[PDB]
Write a protein that binds this ligand. Structure first.
Ligand SMILES: [Zn+2]
Ligand SMILES: [Zn+2]
Ligand SMILES: [Zn+2]
Length: 178
C-alpha cells in the first residue's frame, strides 16, 4: 500500500485498501473508513465494481436524466466519490469549512454552502435525488464567483468547479459533446 493518504497526500494514521494499493486517513475517505470489515475495499474499488458488474453503465447519459435519479445506494456512492474527488485537490481547502463575508463593495450570498456541509448532508441521507447534491456543489462555486467579483481570487472557484464538472462527467458517464 501507499504510505500517504490518497486524498490529502500526508502521512499519518492510514487505513489501507485490501483490493488496491491506496491508503486513507479515517475522515479523508468518504464515507469515513468503516470500523471493522476485513477485508475492506475503498470507494475507488467499490466504484470500479459497479462498472464491472454493469459495463453498459459507462454508455453516455444525459445530465437531465442523471440529476433526476433517486439517491439509491449506487447513486449515494457515486456522489460520495465525486465529493471525495473534489477534496483530492488541494484547492478544496478554500471551500471546505464555513465561510464568512466582509469585503468592501460585496454582500455575502443568500445561501452559503461549503464542502463539509455537503459531506454532512450526504452522511445524514438528506438528499433524495442526485440533483440536490449537484445543486449544492455548484452553489459553492457560484457564491464564490459572485462575492469576489473582479478580484483575481475568483479564479479559485473556476478551478475547483472545473475539477467537479470533469469528475461529474466521468463518474456519471455523461455523453461526450463539443
Ligand atoms: Zn488524508
Ligand atoms: Zn481500493
Ligand atoms: Zn448490466
Amino acid at each position: 500500500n501507499s504510505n500517504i493518504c490518497e486524498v490529502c497526500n500526508k502521512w499519518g494514521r492510514l487505513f489501507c485498501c485490501d483490493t488496491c494499493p491506496r491508503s486513507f486517513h479515517e475522515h479523508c475517505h468518504i464515507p469515513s473508513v468503516e470500523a471493522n470489515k476485513n477485508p475492506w475495499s475503498c470507494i475507488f474499488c467499490r466504484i470500479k465494481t459497479i462498472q464491472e458488474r454493469c459495463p453498459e453503465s459507462q454508455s453516455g447519459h444525459q445530465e437531465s436524466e442523471v440529476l433526476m435519479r433517486q439517491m439509491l445506494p449506487e447513486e449515494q456512492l457515486k456522489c460520495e466519490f465525486l465529493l471525495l474527488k473534489v477534496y483530492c485537490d488541494s484547492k478544496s481547502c478554500f471551500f471546505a469549512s464555513e465561510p464568512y463575508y466582509n469585503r468592501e463593495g460585496s454582500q455575502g450570498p443568500q445561501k452559503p454552502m461549503w464542502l463539509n456541509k455537503v459531506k454532512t448532508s450526504l452522511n445524514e441521507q438528506m438528499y433524495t435525488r442526485v440533483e440536490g447534491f449537484v445543486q449544492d456543489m455548484r452553489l459553492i462555486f457560484h457564491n464564490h464567483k459572485e462575492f469576489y467579483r473582479e478580484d483575481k481570487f475568483t479564479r479559485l472557484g473556476i478551478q475547483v468547479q472545473d475539477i467537479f464538472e470533469k469528475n461529474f462527467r466521468n463518474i456519471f458517464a455523461i455523453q461526450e459533446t463539443s
